[PDB]
Amino acid sequence: MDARATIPEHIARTVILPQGYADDEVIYPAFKWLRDEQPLAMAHIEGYDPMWIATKHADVMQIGKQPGLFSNAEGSEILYDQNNEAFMRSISGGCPHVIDSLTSMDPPTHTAYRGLTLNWFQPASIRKLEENIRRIAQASVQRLLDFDGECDFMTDCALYYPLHVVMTALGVPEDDEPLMLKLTQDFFGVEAARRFHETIATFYDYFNGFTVDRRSCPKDDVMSLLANSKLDGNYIDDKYINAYYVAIATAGHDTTSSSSGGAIIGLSRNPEQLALAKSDPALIPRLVDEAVRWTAPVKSFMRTALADTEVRGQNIKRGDRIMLSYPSANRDEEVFSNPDEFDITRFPNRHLGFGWGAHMCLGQHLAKLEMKIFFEELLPKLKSVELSGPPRLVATNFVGGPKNVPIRFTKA
Ligand code: HEM
């Protein structure tokens, strides 16, 4: 079954299939076997293409730095079994990408489209939003504190906070939360082509009304920036502007909620850390990097090789699919000691949670700023937080992490 495939089928099924990601003691041991035994090897299971699994921190940095060699755009950047990639190419008119977002793009296209928002996402630009993001965090902290010491931290709090922040960055009204939750939770959640096609049409007509509006009535927000952008003396095609609004909102919602949940499971299991964080606010930034390392919400992205190459003495033929495991890179013993412990003091924390390379998460500065402001508002409000039952994690090999964290808390 592709004779170059060496990973034992049991490990291979555990790392690829979506089931095992709902449980950390299923998936982290398998990846640990891989890093210790077959750090970069080929797996081929039934229903999927052969693929190399880059499990080492150093190999994920190296593949991600070379877009000329390992392509986003040639195959599906998302891990789908053949069956599914097929249904998708139907929906998508031949090509393995459901919308034309930055992740489906190789440079120079990618550099141009990414270029349009890149500086709006840089730290200095993101500071303008601070009074707003603190207003949103206080409303969300209040909501949780209105419970008498019990709630699901996700579905009662962290589900809405990251969506409110990305709605404000885009310029979408507070009142359209229903439709944005429908976009990220229902339509892009975890005949069908007939209903796909007219549902994306309805969202595109909706966003289209904002593009037109920002073109006569400009505001400082991402919709206005991209509406009014022009590449070669012409406005960006509506397909790319609307895929960009969708890419930011979906890319920015679940990853930030999941990492905030991850932080609460880590502090609930390690009360010495809550106490440490409460006594030195300077440590919140440290807690945010550790929550995103430890949680690793994006479990993988894919790459297709554009030439025969060699990484860690392996000979990657042209056309080979490669899986990038951000969870395995964040627990590589060559970079981190006791990588399974949640430890907020961990420094330096050079995790690959936001990726590395050309496609490195555009929203990383916005994601660290809104998680830091949320926790600065929340931690002083709590005397304690503990889990009241097991977190429920999403079974998915793409964006998973906690979906339910039932907690008990005492107000300060
Ligand atoms: C803690 C939260 C977040 C995590 C863990 C996360 C993770 C990632 C990862 C792993 C990638 C792939 C990077 C690569 O291939 O090198 C990515 C892509 C991306 N993320 Fe995030 N992300 C987070 C928050 C955000 C936010 C808040 C936004 C939106 C403002 C966002 C927007 C994007 C976009 C647009 C891309 C595509 C960039 C490109 O292809 O050029 N992300 N993110």
Domain limits, the chain: 1-412
Please state, in angstroms and as integers, the Cα–Cα distance from residue 236 to each residue in 229, 242, 267, following that order. Answer: 7, 10, 45
Only one residue has tokens 């990657």, namely 316
Q: Which residues contact 152 (CB under 8 A, 6 or more apart)?
A: 404, 405, 406, 407
116 lines ligand 1 (CB under 6 A): no
Per the CB < 8 A criterion, the answer to whether 50 and 4 are in contact is: yes
64 lines ligand 1 (CB under 6 A): yes
261 lines ligand 1 (CB under 6 A): no
Only one residue has tokens 């932080």, namely 263
Length of the chain in terms of residues written: 412
20 lines ligand 1 (CB under 6 A): no
* Residue 271 phi, psi dihedral angles, 5° rounding: -60, -15
Say whether 95 counts as a known binding-site residue: no
CA angle 338, 342, 345 (to 5 degrees): 90
Q: At 316, which amino acid appears?
A: I
158 CA distance to ligand 1 centroid (A)? 18
Please state, in angstroms and as integers, the Cα–Cα distance from residue 40 to each residue in 36, 139, 210, 316, 319, following that order. Answer: 10, 46, 46, 10, 17
Per the CB < 8 A criterion, the answer to whether 181 and 260 are in contact is: no
400 CA distance to ligand 1 centroid (A)? 14
The Cβ of residue 109 has, within 10 Å, a number of other Cβ atoms equal to 14
67 CA distance to ligand 1 centroid (A)? 16
Report d(CA 88, CA 93) in Å as an integer: 9
Only one residue has tokens 């595109």, namely 204
Class of domain 1-412: mainly alpha
353 CA distance to ligand 1 centroid (A)? 9
Among protein residues, the one with the nearest Cα to ligand 1's atom 6 is 354
- Tell which residue, 52, 108, 106, has the closest CA to residue 79: 52
Residue 110 CA, closest ligand 1 atom number: 41
Please state, in angstroms and as integers, the Cα–Cα distance from residue 18 to each residue in 178, 349, 351, following that order. Answer: 28, 27, 23
- DSSP element (H, E) containing 83: helix 82-91
Report d(CA 366, CA 124) in Å as an integer: 11
Among protein residues, the one with the nearest Cα to ligand 1's atom 20 is 361
Please state, in angstroms and as integers, the Cα–Cα distance from residue 211 to each residue in 120, 138, 270, 290, 304, following that order. Answer: 17, 30, 47, 37, 34
Report d(CA 84, CA 217) in Å as an integer: 42
366 lines ligand 1 (CB under 6 A): yes
In the structure encoding, which two tokens stand for residue 205, read together? 């007509």
Q: Give this entry's resolution in angstroms.
A: 2.3
